[PDB]
């Protein structure tokens, strides 16, 4: 409901002012999705190594959304949410400096590599910090999957890409637009009705299931086929699920409950007995160095 000005117009208002192209130098590409073209970059000043995001304006899957993913980013900083350093806007591209998480993504790690239960729950147990602190101030991010969790060489786990996210507020306390990664939808979003945060809870139960399988459900299938998929298979089967733990099983049931309100919230995940079978977070480096190397080669 905002023209492309009435955005421009936002967007002035709150990156910085002047050209980064000035302000950066020896970039090197090292990611792409639906929205922006990622950089790594050296800060001309200061020697600095960051990642830059590039997003062109006009090729948008929805404009607006651009503006929640500046002011989320800046505004709701966290551990476990990929730190912003600045915005620019030169006429119809839009650039967001943040660190550099020189890990990768977690697609890195979960296509290359066999991560163990230990490993499984560390992981969940960031990434759910992340969706209670996001939740408790009313942000749902709408697209966690493996390819939005940025890993630290060091096994460091933040949430990166609000390019999607929505505020909600009292009068629109729940969402309803058509928006995500299909594959990764919660059912009540595939359907069209109005939804709430715990479509990210949902998320997270997929992406678990990437950690354990390498990719979600349907990924071969055509984005409205998978649509239909979700909507008529509920709760999806895993391949092998007697390879799992039974406390591992329950957790992904609990994830990925049909009903909304039989769904565990973040808080109520983050108590649950998988996570104690953590592993620390240092337990990925070698994973993360694996994945390097073979994508690499
Ligand atoms: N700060 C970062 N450090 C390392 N890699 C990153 C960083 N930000 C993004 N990436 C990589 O670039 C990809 C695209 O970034 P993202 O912000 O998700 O763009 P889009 O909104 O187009 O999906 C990510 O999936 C990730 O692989
Ligand atoms: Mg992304
Ligand atoms: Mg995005």
Same mark, same amino acid.
Request: glycine share 6%.
């Given at each position: 409901?905002?023209?492309?000005?009435?955005?421009?117009?936002?967007?002035?208002?709150?990156?910085?002012?002047?050209?980064?192209?000035?302000?950066?130098?020896?970039?090197?590409?090292?990611?792409?999705?639906?929205?922006?073209?990622?950089?790594?970059?050296?800060?001309?000043?200061?020697?600095?190594?960051?990642?830059?995001?590039?997003?062109?304006?006009?090729?948008?899957?929805?404009?607006?959304?651009?503006?929640?993913?500046?002011?989320?980013?800046?505004?709701?900083?966290?551990?476990?949410?990929?730190?912003?350093?600045?915005?620019?806007?030169?006429?119809?591209?839009?650039?967001?400096?943040?660190?550099?998480?020189?890990?990768?993504?977690?697609?890195?790690?979960?296509?290359?590599?066999? /991560?163990? *239960? +230990?490993?499984?729950?560390?992981?969940?147990?960031?990434? @759910?910090? =992340? !969706?209670?602190?996001?939740?408790? &101030?009313?942000?749902?991010?709408?697209?966690?999957?493996?390819?939005?969790?940025?890993?630290?060489?060091?096994?460091?786990?933040?949430?990166?890409?609000?390019?999607?996210?929505?505020?909600?507020?009292?009068?629109?306390?729940?969402?309803?637009?058509?928006?995500?990664?299909?594959?990764?939808?919660?059912?009540?979003?595939?359907?069209?009705?109005?939804?709430?945060?715990?479509?990210?809870?949902?998320?997270?139960?997929?992406?678990?299931?990437? /950690?354990? *399988? +390498?990719?979600?459900?349907?990924?071969?299938?055509?984005? @409205?086929? =998978? !649509?239909?998929?979700?909507?008529? &298979?509920?709760?999806?089967?895993?391949?092998?699920?007697?390879?799992?733990?039974?406390?591992?099983?329950?957790?992904?049931?609990?994830?990925?409950?049909?009903?909304?309100?039989?769904?565990?919230?973040?808080?109520?995940?983050?108590?649950?007995?998988?996570?104690?079978?953590?592993?620390?977070?240092?337990?990925?480096?070698?994973?993360?160095?694996?994945?390097?190397?073979?994508?690499?080669?």
């Amino acid at each position: 409901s905002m023209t492309d000005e009435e955005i421009l117009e936002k967007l002035r208002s709150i990156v910085s002012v002047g050209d980064p192209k000035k302000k950066y130098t020896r970039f090197e590409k090292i990611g792409q999705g639906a929205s922006g073209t990622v950089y790594t970059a050296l800060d001309i000043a200061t020697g600095q190594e960051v990642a830059i995001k590039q997003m062109n304006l006009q090729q948008q899957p929805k404009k607006e959304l651009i503006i929640n993913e500046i002011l989320v980013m800046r505004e709701n900083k966290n551990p476990n949410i990929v730190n912003y350093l600045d915005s620019y806007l030169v006429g119809d591209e839009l650039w967001v400096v943040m660190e550099y998480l020189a890990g990768g993504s977690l697609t890195d790690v979960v296509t290359e590599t066999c /991560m163990d *239960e +230990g490993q499984i729950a560390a992981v969940c147990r960031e990434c @759910l910090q =992340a !969706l209670d602190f996001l939740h408790s &101030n009313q942000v749902i991010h709408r697209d966690i999957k493996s390819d939005n969790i940025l890993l630290g060489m060091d096994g460091s786990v933040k949430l990166t890409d609000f390019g999607f996210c929505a505020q909600i507020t009292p009068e629109q306390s729940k969402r309803s637009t058509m928006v995500g990664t299909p594959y990764w939808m919660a059912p009540e979003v595939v359907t069209r009705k109005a939804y709430g945060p715990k479509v990210d809870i949902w998320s997270l139960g997929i992406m678990a299931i990437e /950690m354990v *399988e +390498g990719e979600p459900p349907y990924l071969n299938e055509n984005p @409205l086929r =998978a !649509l239909y998929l979700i909507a008529t &298979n509920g709760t999806p089967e895993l391949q092998n699920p007697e390879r799992l733990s039974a406390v591992f099983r329950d957790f992904l049931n609990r994830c990925l409950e049909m009903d909304v309100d039989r769904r565990g919230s973040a808080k109520e995940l983050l108590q649950h007995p998988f996570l104690k079978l953590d592993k620390p977070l240092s337990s990925l480096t070698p994973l993360i160095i694996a994945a390097k190397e073979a994508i690499k080669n």
